[PDB]
Coordinates of C-alpha atoms and ligand atoms in Angstrom, one line a residue:
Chain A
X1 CA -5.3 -8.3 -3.6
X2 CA -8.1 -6.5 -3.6
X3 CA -9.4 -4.9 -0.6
X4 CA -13.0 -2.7 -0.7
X5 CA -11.8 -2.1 -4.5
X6 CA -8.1 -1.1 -3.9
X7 CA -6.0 -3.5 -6.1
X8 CA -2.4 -4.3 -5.6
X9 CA 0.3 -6.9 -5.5
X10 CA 2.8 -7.6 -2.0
X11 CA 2.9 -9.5 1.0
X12 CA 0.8 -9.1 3.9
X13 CA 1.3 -9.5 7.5
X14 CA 0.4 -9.3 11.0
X15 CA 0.2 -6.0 12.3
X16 CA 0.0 -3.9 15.5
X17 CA -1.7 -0.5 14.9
X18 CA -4.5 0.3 16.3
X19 CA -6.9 2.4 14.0
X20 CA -9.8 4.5 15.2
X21 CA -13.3 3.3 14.2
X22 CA -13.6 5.8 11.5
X23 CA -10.3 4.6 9.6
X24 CA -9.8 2.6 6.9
X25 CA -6.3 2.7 5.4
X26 CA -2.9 4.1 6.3
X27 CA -0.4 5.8 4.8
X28 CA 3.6 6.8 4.7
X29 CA 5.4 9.4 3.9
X30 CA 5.4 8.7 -0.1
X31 CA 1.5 8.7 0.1
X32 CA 1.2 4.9 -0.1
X33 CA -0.9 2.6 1.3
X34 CA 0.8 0.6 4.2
X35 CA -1.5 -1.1 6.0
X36 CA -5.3 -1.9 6.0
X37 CA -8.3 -3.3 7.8
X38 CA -10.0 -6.6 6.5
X39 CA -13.3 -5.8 6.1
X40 CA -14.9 -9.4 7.5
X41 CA -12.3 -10.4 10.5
X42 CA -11.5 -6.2 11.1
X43 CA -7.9 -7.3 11.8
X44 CA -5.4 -5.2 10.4
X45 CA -2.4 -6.0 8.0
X46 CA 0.6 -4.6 7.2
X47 CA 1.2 -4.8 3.1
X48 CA 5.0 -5.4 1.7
X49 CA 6.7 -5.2 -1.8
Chain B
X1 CA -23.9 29.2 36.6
X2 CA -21.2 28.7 32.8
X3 CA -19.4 30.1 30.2
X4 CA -18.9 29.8 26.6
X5 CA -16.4 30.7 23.9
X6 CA -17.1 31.6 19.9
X7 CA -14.0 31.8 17.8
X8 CA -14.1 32.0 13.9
X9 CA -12.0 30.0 11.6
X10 CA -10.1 31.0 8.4
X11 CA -8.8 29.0 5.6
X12 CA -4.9 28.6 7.0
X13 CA -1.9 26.1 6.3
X14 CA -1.0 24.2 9.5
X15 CA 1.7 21.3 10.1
X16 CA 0.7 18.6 12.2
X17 CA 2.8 16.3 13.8
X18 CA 2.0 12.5 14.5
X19 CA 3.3 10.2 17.1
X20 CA 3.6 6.6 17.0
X21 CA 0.5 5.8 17.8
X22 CA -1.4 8.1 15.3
X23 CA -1.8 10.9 17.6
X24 CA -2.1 14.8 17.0
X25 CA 0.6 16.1 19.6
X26 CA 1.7 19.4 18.2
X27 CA 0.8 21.9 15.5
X28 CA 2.7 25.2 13.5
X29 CA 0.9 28.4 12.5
X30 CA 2.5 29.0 9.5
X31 CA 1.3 32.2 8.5
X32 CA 1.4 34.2 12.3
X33 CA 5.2 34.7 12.5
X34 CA 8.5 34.8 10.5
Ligands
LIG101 C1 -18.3 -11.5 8.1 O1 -18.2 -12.9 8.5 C2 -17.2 -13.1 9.5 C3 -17.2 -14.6 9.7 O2 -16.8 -15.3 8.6 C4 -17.5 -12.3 10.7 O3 -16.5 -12.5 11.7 C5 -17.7 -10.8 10.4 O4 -18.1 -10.1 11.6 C6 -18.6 -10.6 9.3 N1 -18.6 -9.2 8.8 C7 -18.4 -8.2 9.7 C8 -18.5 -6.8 9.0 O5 -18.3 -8.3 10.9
LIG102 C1 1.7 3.8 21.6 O1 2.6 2.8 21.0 C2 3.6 2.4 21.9 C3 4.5 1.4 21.0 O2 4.6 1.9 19.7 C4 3.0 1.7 23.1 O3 4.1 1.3 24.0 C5 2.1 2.7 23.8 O4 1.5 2.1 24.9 C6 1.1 3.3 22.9 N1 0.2 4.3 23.5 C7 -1.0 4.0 24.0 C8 -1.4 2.5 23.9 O5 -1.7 4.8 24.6

């Protein structure tokens, strides 16, 4: 994938977060990305290894 | 027929702590106390 330039491999999903307006990615505690917003349908996904 | 406050800021470490939902709930001064 790449999302607004972020490249990666995994699986995404379905999610249930609910980011503020002014947010774009997430992140855990090992400074990954986690989830993300799709930048046409602004649904949000959950990314997987 | 009002107040106002004016506080002044200084570079600090803080930790934050979120909650489920991505919320700021609670915050430590590090440098005010043992
Ligand atoms: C891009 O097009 C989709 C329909 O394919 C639309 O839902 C979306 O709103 C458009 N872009 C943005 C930023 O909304
Ligand atoms: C925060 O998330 C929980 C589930 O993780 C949900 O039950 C709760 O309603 C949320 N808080 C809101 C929507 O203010």
């Amino acid at each position: 994938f790449n999302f607004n330039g972020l490249t990666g491999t995994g699986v995404l999903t379905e999610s249930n977060k609910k980011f503020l307006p002014f947010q774009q990615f997430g992140r855990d505690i090992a400074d990954t990305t986690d989830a993300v917003r799709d930048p046409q349908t602004l649904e949000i996904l959950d990314i997987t290894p | 027929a009002a107040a106002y406050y004016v506080g002044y800021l200084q570079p600090r470490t803080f930790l934050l702590k979120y909650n489920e939902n991505g919320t700021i709930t609670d915050a430590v001064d590090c440098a005010l106390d043992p």
